[PDB]
Amino acid sequence: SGFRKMAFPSGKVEGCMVQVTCGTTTLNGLWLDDVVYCPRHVICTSEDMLNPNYEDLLIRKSNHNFLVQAGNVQLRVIGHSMQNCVLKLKVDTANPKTPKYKFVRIQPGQTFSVLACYNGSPSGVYQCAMRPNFTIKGSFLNGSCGSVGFNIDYDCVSFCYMHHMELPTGVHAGTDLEGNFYGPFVDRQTAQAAGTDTTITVNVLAWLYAAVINGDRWFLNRFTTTLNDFNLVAMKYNYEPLTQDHVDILGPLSAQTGIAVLDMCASLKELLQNGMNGRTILGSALLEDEFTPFDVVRQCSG
Amino acid sequence: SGFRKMAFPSGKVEGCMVQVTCGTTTLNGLWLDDVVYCPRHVICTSEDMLNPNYEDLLIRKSNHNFLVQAGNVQLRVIGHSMQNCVLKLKVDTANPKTPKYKFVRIQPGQTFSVLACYNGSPSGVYQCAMRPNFTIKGSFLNGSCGSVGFNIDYDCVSFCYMHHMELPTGVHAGTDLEGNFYGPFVDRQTAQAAGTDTTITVNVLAWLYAAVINGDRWFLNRFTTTLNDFNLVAMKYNYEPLTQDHVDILGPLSAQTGIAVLDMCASLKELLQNGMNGRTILGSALLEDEFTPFDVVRQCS
Ligand SMILES: *[C@@](O)(CO)[C@H](C[C@@H]1CCNC1=O)NC(=O)[C@H](CC(C)C)NC(=O)c1cc2c(OC)cccc2[nH]1
Ligand SMILES: *[C@@](O)(CO)[C@H](C[C@@H]1CCNC1=O)NC(=O)[C@H](CC(C)C)NC(=O)c1cc2c(OC)cccc2[nH]1
C-alpha cells in the first residue's frame, strides 16, 4: 500500500548520457550504438540563437567542430546530420551500454520519466505528464538541454522526449527523438506562450481511485451521473471530456474498489462545484491530474 | 526551473540488486563487493514470522540453504552471519558494479531515494523523508522487502534504509544497513503502531527559503525570535524542535537570501499562529516539509 509519484529506474538511460560542445555552447547528448542525438541549437552562438537558419549554420560546420565527451573519454565525430530539431553525430565507437530501445511520440495525458542531466552527467529523475497544451511541468536549469524522457517496458527503453526550452511561465517544452516539437514551439531565443491548458480528466479519476484504495473516502457521495452530464460540467471547469475508452481504461480500478466509473464522476463533479473545503486527498489541497490509470494500477493492484 | 520532488539517478543501486530465497520465502538483497545484505526474516516460513526466535531459526541454516540470484544467475553463498535485523551472506563473486559506498544512519527529516524492487528487479524510484515518528510514506507491495533507500554524494552512494514492514496505517518501517530499525518497530508479523507524527520544521524553513529565492516573500515579517522560544512555540503546533545541526544546515540558504535563520523562524511562527489566510507559497496552500535544505540547494543550483 501507499501511493507515490514514482519514476522508472534510470540506469539504462544513464549509460547513454554524454556531453556535446560546439564552440562555447555545451549541452547533453544521447549516445545509442554509434550515434549521439542532441538538440541542434548546440551549433549556435549567442547571436545565432535569435533567428537561426539551421541548414545554413550546419553546412558551415565540420566534424572537428563537435566535441563529444563520455565521462573522461573524448569520442571522435566522423559524420553529422540533422533531423528536424535534433542533431545526429556519428562517432567512431559504439556505446556498449546501449539498451534495447525505441523512439516513440507520446500522447497528451500520458506520463514519462525524465533523467535531468548537466554536462553529460545524470543529476535527478522525476515523472512528468505531457499536458494537453504540450508543455511539461519539470525542473530544468541551465545546461539541462538534451536531457531525455522515457518509459521502460520489459528491458526496452521507449524514448519520447528531449528537452529544449523553458517558457516564461516556468513550464518546459521539447521534442520527440525525431526532432519534432510537442506543441507550437520553435527552437529560437524568443518568449513563447503555450495554448490554454486543460485538466486531464481520466487521470484525476484514476487518482481519486488511488485515494479510495489508500483510505481517503470523504469525497464519495450517493449521487450518480450520466457520462454526458458529467462531461458538460467537466468542460465548464476546463477539464477534458471523458470518452468511453477512458471509462473502459478505468474498469480495473472500478472493479477493485466496487465504485462504478460514473459514481466516481459524480464525486468529481461535486468536488469541482463545491471545492475541497480545506480538506486534502492523498495529502494534496488540489486535484492531481499527472497520474495515468496505468500509473495507479502499478501501485494499487493487489 | 520549477520545484519538483526528484530522486537520485538509480543506476548505481540497480547494479547491486539481487534476490535472496530461503525455502519458498523470497525478498531483495543488496550485493556490494562479495557480500549480500538482506532482511533476516527471509529464513522464516509464513508461520515462523508470527513469533520468531531468529537465533534458533538461523542455527538450523547452512550456507547451502540460501539461494542468491542476480537475475537467473546464482551467486554461491560461502558464509553467513546475522547483524541485528539483517543477514549478511558472503558470496563467491565480487560485484563488478559495486559503486563507492558508505552505510549511514539518517535523522528524521532527512530525505532519500527509494529503489522499489520485486524479485531482485528494480521497478521504480521515488523520494521519501524519514518522518519524526520513524516511518516513511512509501509505496511498497508484497515482495518489496530488502528494497533500499540511499543518497548519492558525488559518486559515493550512502545507503540509509532497507525495507521490512508496512504498518496498519499504510506507512512503512525499516532498518539501516546495520539492521537497526528506525523507530520502535520489530520484525515480526504483528500490527504495530508508530508514535504521533510531527511536522519537520527544518524542512518547512528550507521551503520558505526556496520561496524567497524565487521572489515569493509576502510572509517575511519584521520580527526575530530566540531558538529556545521558537522551539517551545513550535511544539504547541505539532512541529519538531530545531537542533543546532538544523540551524547549521540552513546556513547556505540564509547566506544566499540574506535572511537570518532566526528571522525566518519568526516568520514561520506568524504563519503558524495566524494561518495562510487564503494565500499560497510556491503555488501551495500547505507548508511543505519533505524538502531538506540540500534538496532546495540541489534543485535551485
Ligand atoms: C538549454 O539548456 C540550452 O542549451 C536551455 C534549457 C533552459 C535553461 C533554463 N531552463 C531550461 O529549461 N534552453 C534554452 O535556453 C532555450 C534555447 C533555445 C531553444 C535556442 N531557450 C529558452 O528556453 C528561452 C529563451 C527565452 C526568451 O528569449 C528572449 C524569453 C523568455 C523565455 C525564454 N526561454
Ligand atoms: C516484505 O516483502 C516481506 O519479506 C513485506 C513488505 C510489506 C508487504 C506489503 N507491503 C509491504 O511493505 N513485509 C512484511 O510482510 C512484514 C514481515 C515481517 C517483517 C516478518 N510484515 C508486515 O509488514 C506486517 C504484518 C502485519 C500484521 O500482522 C498480523 C498486521 C498488520 C500489519 C502488518 N504488517
What kind of experiment solved this structure?
X-ray
Minimum distance, in Å, between the CA of residue A127 and any CA atom of chain B: 9
Residues of chain B found within 8 Å of residue A12, distances taken between Cβ atoms: 11
Residues of chain B found within 8 Å of residue A4, distances taken between Cβ atoms: 126, 128, 137-139
Q: Compute how many other C-beta atoms are within 10 angstroms of the C-beta atom of residue A177.
A: 24
Tell which residues of chain B come right before a gap with C–N over 2.5 A: none
Minimum distance, in Å, between the CA of residue A9 and any CA atom of chain B: 5
Q: Is A117 a catalytic residue?
A: no
Measured CA to CA, the distance from residue A147 to residue A141 in angstroms comes to 11
- DSSP collapsed to 3 states, B63-125: HHHCEEEECCEEECEEEEEEECCEEEEEECCCCCCCCEEEECCCCCCCEEEEEEEECCEEEEE
What value does the CA radius of gyration of chain B take, rounded to a whole number of Å?
22
Tell which residues of chain A come right before a gap with C–N over 2.5 A: none
Three cell numbers, residue A156? 526496452
- Only one residue has cell 550515434, namely A35
The one-letter code for the residue type at A125 is V
Using the Cα atoms of residue B146, residue B149, residue B152 and residue B156 in order, give the sign of their dihedral.
Answer: negative
Residues of chain B found within 8 Å of residue A5, distances taken between Cβ atoms: 5, 126
3-state secondary structure of A36: strand
Going by their DSSP bridges, the two strands A100-103 and A156-166 should be labelled as: parallel
Measured CA to CA, the distance from residue A84 to residue A174 in angstroms comes to 12
Is any atom of ligand 1 closer than 6 Å to the C-beta of B2?
no
What is the DSSP track for B169-231? TS-EEEE-TTSPBSSS--SSSS---PPPP-B-HHHHHHHHHHHHHTT--TT--S----HHHHH
Residues of chain A found within 8 Å of residue B142, distances taken between Cβ atoms: 302
Closest protein CA for atom 20 of ligand 1? A188
Minimum CA–CA partner of A116 in chain B: B9
Distance of alpha carbon A176 from its chain centroid, rounded? Answer: 10
Chain A residue set in contact with B, beta carbons under 8 Å: 1-12, 14-15, 115-116, 122-126, 137-141, 166, 170-171, 214-215, 280, 285, 298-299, 301-302
3-state secondary structure of A75: strand
Provide the resolution (angstroms).
1.4
- Residue A273: name the closest of A302, A221, A234 by CA: A234
Measured CA to CA, the distance from residue B79 to residue B84 in angstroms comes to 17
Supply angle C-alpha A7, A89, A56, rounded to 5.
115
CB A100 within 8 A of CB A110: no
- Only one residue has cell 524479485, namely B119
Measured CA to CA, the distance from residue B125 to residue B9 in angstroms comes to 9
Mutation pick from B12, B17, B126, B142 vs chain A, by most beta carbons of A within 10 Å, is B126
Measured CA to CA, the distance from residue A158 to residue A161 in angstroms comes to 10
- Going by the DSSP 8-state scheme, the letter that residue A168 receives in this structure is T
Q: Compute how many other C-beta atoms are within 10 angstroms of the C-beta atom of residue A234.
A: 21
Q: Compute how many other C-beta atoms are within 10 angstroms of the C-beta atom of residue A79.
A: 12
Using the Cα atoms of residue B51, residue B54, residue B57 and residue B62 in order, give the sign of their dihedral.
Answer: positive
Minimum CA–CA partner of A299 in chain B: B139
Tell me phi and psi for residue B116, to 5 degrees.
Answer: -70, 125
- Only one residue has cell 524553513, namely B205
Measured CA to CA, the distance from residue A252 to residue B231 in angstroms comes to 48
Distances in Å between the Cα of B178 and the Cα atoms of A226, B40, B81 are: 57, 11, 12
| Catalytic option among B16, B38, B41, B164 | B41
Measured CA to CA, the distance from residue A27 to residue A17 in angstroms comes to 11
What value does the CA radius of gyration of chain A take, rounded to a whole number of Å?
22
Q: Which ligand is nearest to the CA of B147?
A: 2
- Going by the DSSP 8-state scheme, the letter that residue A215 receives in this structure is T
Three cell numbers, residue B248? 547549521
Measured CA to CA, the distance from residue A259 to residue A250 in angstroms comes to 11
Using the Cα atoms of residue A205, residue A157, residue A3 and residue B145 in order, give the sign of their dihedral.
Answer: positive
Minimum CA–CA partner of B300 in chain A: A141
What are residue A157's DSSP bridge partners?
A101, A152
Q: Compute how many other C-beta atoms are within 10 angstroms of the C-beta atom of residue A255.
A: 10
- Residue B174: name the closest of B143, B193, B149 by CA: B149
Angle at which helices B201-213 and B293-300 cross, to 10°: 20
The edge-to-edge listing of strands for the beta sheet with A73-75 is: A73-75, A66-70, A17-22, A25-32, A35-39, A86-91, A77-83
Distances in Å between the Cα of A236 and the Cα atoms of A199, A233, B165, B213 are: 11, 5, 45, 36
Please enumerate in sequence order all residues whose Cβ is within 8 A of that of B60, keeping only pairs 6 or more positions apart, or say none. Answer: none
Q: Compute how many other C-beta atoms are within 10 angstroms of the C-beta atom of residue A302.
A: 7
Q: Which of A3, A14, A123 minimises the CB distance to B11?
A: A14
Measured CA to CA, the distance from residue A132 to residue A120 in angstroms comes to 30
Measured CA to CA, the distance from residue B11 to residue A270 in angstroms comes to 44
Tell me phi and psi for residue B228, to 5 degrees.
Answer: -65, -45
